[PDB]
């Protein structure tokens, strides 16, 4: 109904980069980085977007 911005993985790698760059998902949750939000959507077969960067 709303939204903004899709979280990107490194597809050419199946683990993430270890930087701390929290993202606020459209779900109300904080993700340590974007790659995390992506792997979580993959596993969960979910489609959570990034609400705002930084923490919720």
């Amino acid at each position: 109904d709303s939204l903004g911005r899709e979280a990107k993985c490194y597809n050419e790698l199946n683990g993430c980069t270890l930087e701390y760059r929290p993202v606020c998902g459209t779900d109300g949750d904080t993700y340590p980085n974007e790659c995390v939000l992506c792997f979580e959507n993959r596993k969960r077969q979910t489609s959570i977007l990034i609400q705002k960067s930084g923490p919720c």
Partner: protein
């Protein structure tokens, strides 16, 4: 190089579920990369009184700050150094798809003032060989549990052994390149916020920079090896950028 005035105390807790808290000041080369907002997003190690070495995926800007001498980030105040950055040297061969050649050099505007709590790490020789199965140290403010989503205030340190390319490929398979070195898979993991920090292997009394925190398990799996930028494979570039700058 590579001798903390202040001596680390590595206990058996350093080897299990995401290490322990460091003796304050015991890893002097440990710095924190921060925003204008004072928010920690990567680590780094001081190789000079002028340069910091880090991972290239970190996206360090000239707008970002290097904080030397911190223990407790939640300190209303301690004696630290907020050094500015003047020039960023991102490896030309860094591959963004692959995270291969994941080193970046930060040249400081403001020299760091080596103290008892601020010093530098020894860089290795290209021909240097750090045997698989050697127990090393990794330091940072990376999460302690993926499930925390709150980076710790205090520097942590984990003890993990080195791995052969060969036995890491069993877990990462083809992703493992030559400018990469694996470590852990032993009860301890590098995690969000540890990126660009050090993987120190003591050599002939000195603590030496063998890896840079790069990437690994999307969930900070203690039974999976963590990947680091392999310093021996990128040190001539460090040497040559330093010389021309």
């Amino acid at each position: 190089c590579g001798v903390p005035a202040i001596q680390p105390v590595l206990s058996g807790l350093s080897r299990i579920v995401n290490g322990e808290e460091a003796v304050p000041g015991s890893w002097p080369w440990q710095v924190s990369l921060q925003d204008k907002t004072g928010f920690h997003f990567c680590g780094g190690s001081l190789i000079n009184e002028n340069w910091v070495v880090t991972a290239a995926h970190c996206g360090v800007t000239t707008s970002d700050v290097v904080v030397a001498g911190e223990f407790d980030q939640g300190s209303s105040s301690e004696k630290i150094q907020k050094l500015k950055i003047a020039k960023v040297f991102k490896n030309s061969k860094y591959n963004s798809l692959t995270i291969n050649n994941d080193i970046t050099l930060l040249k400081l505007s403001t020299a760091a003032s080596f103290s008892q709590t601020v010093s530098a790490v020894c860089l290795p020789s290209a021909s240097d060989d750090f045997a698989a199965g050697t127990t090393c140290v990794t330091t940072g403010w990376g999460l302690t549990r993926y499930t925390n989503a709150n980076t710790p205030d205090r520097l942590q340190q984990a003890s993990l052994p080195l791995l052969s390319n060969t036995n890491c490929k069993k877990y990462w398979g083809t992703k493992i390149k030559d400018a990469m070195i694996c470590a852990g898979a032993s009860g301890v993991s590098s995690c969000m916020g540890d990126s660009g920090g050090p993987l120190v292997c003591k050599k002939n009394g000195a603590w030496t920079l063998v890896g840079i925190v790069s990437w690994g398990s999307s969930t900070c799996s203690t039974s999976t090896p963590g990947v680091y930028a392999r310093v021996t494979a990128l040190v001539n570039w460090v040497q040559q950028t330093l010389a021309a700058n």
